[PDB]
Amino acid sequence: GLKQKIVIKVAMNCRSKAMALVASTGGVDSVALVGDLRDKIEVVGYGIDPIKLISALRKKVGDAELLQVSQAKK
Amino acid sequence: KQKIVIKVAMEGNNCRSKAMALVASTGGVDSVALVGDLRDKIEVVGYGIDPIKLISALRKKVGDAELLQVSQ
Amino acid sequence: IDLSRERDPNFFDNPGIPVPECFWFMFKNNVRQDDGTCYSSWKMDMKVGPNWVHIKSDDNCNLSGDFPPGWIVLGKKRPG
């Protein structure tokens, strides 16, 4: 199987709470604050359910929008 | 801009999730990544990170943690 | 639109997967909305305005996909 890349836009110290929450998700290899405004989370890992993660972000942090799903190439 | 790498005794009981969450929540952190084949080291990148505090927190809340690297 | 005069996407290369070879930039009416990195000779699903779009990249980071009117996603190689 291949690794996943997920980018989520989040309303955002919400940044620490969002990073903490995504970093705590099963199968996560990394989380990074990306974009000029540091308002995006890029997640890399395996077996991450993006619908489950957007739900957790909305219920814990605030408005969250799925922007990108893609696999790692090799 | 800092890069900090920490070896953590992460064995069993979703200690990885616990330690990633703890590091991810730290002041000044832009990115956190499990690194090495065994994903048994954490790479932290950001601004104004206190590596003493972070190591303390990890030994308190998770398991043994060793600074492998700090660079700027 | 001229990708020479758009500054670099704020990025983070996960060290456990290969380094993606392309920068991308998304515009609504020739205004930048969003940016990031992607692999050459690959694909990604992206939200572009109201629609999910399958974006294919070739080996030069040119991006094709059915973009809603007023929107485009353009791509270029990172140094090397």
Author numbering:
A (entry chain B): 186 to 197, 201 to 262
B (entry chain A): 188 to 259
C (entry chain C): 33 to 112
Cite, word for word, the article reporting this structure.
The rice NLR pair Pik-1/Pik-2 recognizes AVR-Pik effectors from the blast fungus Magnaporthe oryzae, triggering immune responses that limit rice blast infection. The sensor NLR Pik-1 harbours an integrated heavy metal associated (HMA) domain that directly binds AVR-Pik triggering immune responses. Allelic variation in a heavy metal associated (HMA) domain integrated in the receptor Pik-1 confers differential binding to AVR-Pik variants, determining resistance specificity. AVR-Pik is one of the several rice blast effectors characterized to date, and belongs to the Magnaporthe AVRs and ToxB like (MAX) effector family, whose members share a similar overall structural scaffold despite divergent sequence.
To gain a mechanistic understanding of how the Pikh Asn261Lys polymorphism increases the association of the receptor with AVR-Pik effectors, we determined the crystal structure of Pikh-HMA in complex with AVR-PikC. The complex was subsequently crystallised and X-ray diffraction data were collected at the Diamond Light Source (Oxford, UK) to 2.3 Å resolution. However, this conformation is similar to that observed in Pikm-HMA in complex with multiple AVR-Pik effectors. To date, there are no reported Pik NLR alleles that confer resistance to rice blast strains carrying AVR-PikC. This effector variant differs from AVR-PikE by a single polymorphism, Ala67Asp, located at the binding interface with the receptor. By contrast, in the structure of Pikh-HMA/AVR-PikC, the sidechain of Asp67 extends towards the HMA, and the nearby loop containing Asp224 is shifted away from the effector, likely as a consequence of steric clash and/or repulsion due to the matching charges of the two side chains. As a result, there are no hydrogen bonds formed between Asp224 of Pikh-HMA and Arg64 of AVR-PikC. Instead, the side chain of Arg64 forms an intramolecular hydrogen bond with the side chain of Asp67. We propose that disruption of hydrogen bonding network at this interface accounts for the lower binding affinity of Pik-HMA domains for AVR-PikC, and the lack of recognition of this effector by Pik NLR proteins in rice.
